[PDB]
Amino acid sequence: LDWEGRWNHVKKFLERSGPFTHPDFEPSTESLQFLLDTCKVLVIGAGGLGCELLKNLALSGFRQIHVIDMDTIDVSNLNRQFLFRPKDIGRPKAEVAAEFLNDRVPNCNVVPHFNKIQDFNDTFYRQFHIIVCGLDSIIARRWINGMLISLLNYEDGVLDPSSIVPLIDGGTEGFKGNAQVILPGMTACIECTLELYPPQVNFPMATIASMPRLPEHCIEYVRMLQWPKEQPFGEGVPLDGDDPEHIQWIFQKSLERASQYNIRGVTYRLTQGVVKRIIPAVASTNAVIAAVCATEVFKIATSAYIPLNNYLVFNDVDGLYTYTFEAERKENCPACSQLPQNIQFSPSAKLQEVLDYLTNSASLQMKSPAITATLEGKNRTLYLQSVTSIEERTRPNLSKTLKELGLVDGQELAVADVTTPQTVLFKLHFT
């Protein structure tokens, strides 16, 4: 039970009518109890935003919460992931976090899930009412975006609203952060705005081991080449970023490479940063995004106010700045599109020039797609790329053509990728 006054800071918004209230709103004195009991919410990620989100959700009237995180507690976490003490190092974040939370907040029912978000399938996600992110890789944001979309049920052309699972996403990176609110098949998805991301600084292979002019070049080498060419800890043994010894060996073999081309600037911290692609992080920014996102989860579950139309960006560096706007949902979008994609392509063109279209077009950017079609009344894998075995069995067909493999325009094209759980469909068009 709840002690006197425990939720007054919430009841104001559920028991009272308001001008800025969402239209479906209904002031009631039973709302809070209902929220507390039935509203199931899934929190993806439990570090930085994850910790902050669980606290925020718990104190906002949420009780039925699950958290998925495949990570282990580390020392560096401790400066911004307040649910972990040093005693808890080594344990699984997801576990320690529900532990702490369930303890600090009286009757919380935080359920931990120690695993990759990819071990679960629609069956599992279909059960939540709102899902909140706090991932730290773009791919995961991508993956869980498709998953939520695949759950969309179209009642013959028309969408069935009761199958839309709201997805709030957070992102942090130094004194900068942002949050989005997604309504699968209604609002812009993660794909629809995949371009708002920055470019990835890919050191040109040449300079890395030829024209090194920066301390990073004199590390990217000692990692991308010299280590493989001299297994320091037995052949086949991988470079373990979290191992203070491989860093030392890399830092050491970095000083030497730096010294060779007289490039000052090599240091342990810089070496640790290159080898692990570290992103400077403070607790402050995470408290902010996680705060915004929680307020949306609250809004979305209660109808106390109108949920953020699309996007929020935040910057702490020079004063305080935020910009909110309504990102557009692309009607062409590989993900969102309730229908296939029309691809202009002369039946003369080769495969590679259609594979790389998926691999290189900045609007659809996949890491390793694998197309397939229906040819002799049976689905043949034109090209798959996952298991080394099939790539070679299909690698030859990457020279053929559309009239070459039996591809007559008008037929769909199932494309699968690591990026998303669903199978993206297209429509061939010969020009």
Partner 1 sequence: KLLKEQKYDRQLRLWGDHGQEALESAHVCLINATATGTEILKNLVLPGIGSFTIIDGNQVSGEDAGNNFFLQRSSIGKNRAEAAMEFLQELNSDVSGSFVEESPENLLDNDPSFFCRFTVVVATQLPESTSLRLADVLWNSQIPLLICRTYGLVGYMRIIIKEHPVIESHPDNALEDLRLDKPFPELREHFQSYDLHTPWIVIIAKYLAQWYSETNGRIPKTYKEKEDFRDLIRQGILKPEDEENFEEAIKNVNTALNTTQIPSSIEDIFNDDRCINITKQTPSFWILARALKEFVAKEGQGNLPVRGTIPDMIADSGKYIKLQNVYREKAKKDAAAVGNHVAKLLQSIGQAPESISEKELKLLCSNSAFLRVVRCRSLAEEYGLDTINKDEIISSMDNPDNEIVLYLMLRAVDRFHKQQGRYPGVSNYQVEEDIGKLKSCLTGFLQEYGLSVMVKDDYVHEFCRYGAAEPHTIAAFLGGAAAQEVIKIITKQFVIFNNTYIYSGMSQTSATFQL
Partner 2 sequence: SMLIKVKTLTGKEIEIDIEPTDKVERIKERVEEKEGIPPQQQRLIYSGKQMNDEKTAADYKILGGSVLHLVLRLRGG
Furthest C-alpha separation in the chain: 75
| Residue in the structure block whose two tokens are 């939540």 | 128
Q: Does 50 bind partner 2 (CB under 8 A)?
A: yes
* Partner whose binding site includes residue 336, from partner 2, partner 1, Zn ion, none (CB under 5 to 8 Å by kind): Zn ion
Smallest distance, partner 1 to C-beta of residue 423, A: 35
Instruction: List the single partner that 189 binds among Zn ion, partner 2, partner 1, none, CB under 5 to 8 Å by kind.
Output: Zn ion
Query: Which residues between 308 and 367 bind partner 1 (CB under 8 A)?
Result: 308, 312, 315-322, 324
Among 21, 163, 303, 315, binds partner 2 (CB under 8 A): 315
Closest distance to partner 1 from the beta carbon of 286 (Å): 7
How far is the CA of 125 from the CAs of 80, 93, 313, in angstroms? 28, 21, 27
Residue recorded with tokens 């040819």: 375
CA distance 247 to 47: 23
Breaks (C-N over 2.5 A) in the chain follow: none
Q: Of partner 2, partner 1, Zn ion, none, which one does residue 377 interact with (CB within 5 to 8 Å by kind)?
A: none
Nearest approach in angstroms of CB 313 to partner 2 is: 5
Q: Residue 391: is it exposed, middle or buried by C-beta count within 10 angstroms (0-12/13-18/19+)? A: middle
Exposure string for 111-123, b = 16+ CB within 10 A, e = fewer: ebbbeebeebeee
Helix (H) or strand (E) holding 314: strand 311-315
Does 90 interact with partner 1 (rule: CB under 8 A)?
no
Q: Which of partner 2, Zn ion, partner 1, none is residue 326 near (CB under 5 to 8 Å by kind)?
A: partner 2
DSSP 71: -
User: Binding to partner 1 by residue 105, rule CB under 8 A?
Assistant: yes
160 vs 164: CA distance, rounded Å: 8
Site for partner 2 in 148-207 (CB under 8 A): 170-174, 176-178, 193, 195-199
Q: Which of 96, 147, 281, 358 forms a contact with partner 2 (CB under 8 A)? A: 281
Q: Name 36's Cβ contacts closer than 8 Å, sequence gap at least 6.
A: 61, 62, 63
For residue 50, the minimal CB distance to partner 2 (Å) is 7
197 binds partner 1 (CB under 8 A): no
Residues 144-183, one symbol each (x = binds partner 1 by CB under 8 A, - = not), give: ------------------------------xx--------
Q: Hey, what are 178's tokens?
A: 């942002």
Token pair, residue 243, equals 């191992």
When the beta carbons of 154 and 323 are compared against partner 1, the nearer one is: 323
Return the structure tokens found at 213: 């002019």
* 331 touches partner 2 (CB under 8 A): no
Restricted to residues 259-298, the positions that interact with partner 1 (CB under 8 A) are: 261-263, 269, 272-273, 278-288, 290-292, 294-296, 298
Residue 81 Ramachandran class (φ > 0 left, ψ -120 to 50 alpha, else beta): beta
Name the residues that contact partner 2, by CB under 8 A.
45, 47-50, 133-138, 170-174, 176-178, 193, 195-199, 279, 281, 286, 289, 310-311, 313, 315, 317-319, 321, 323, 325-328
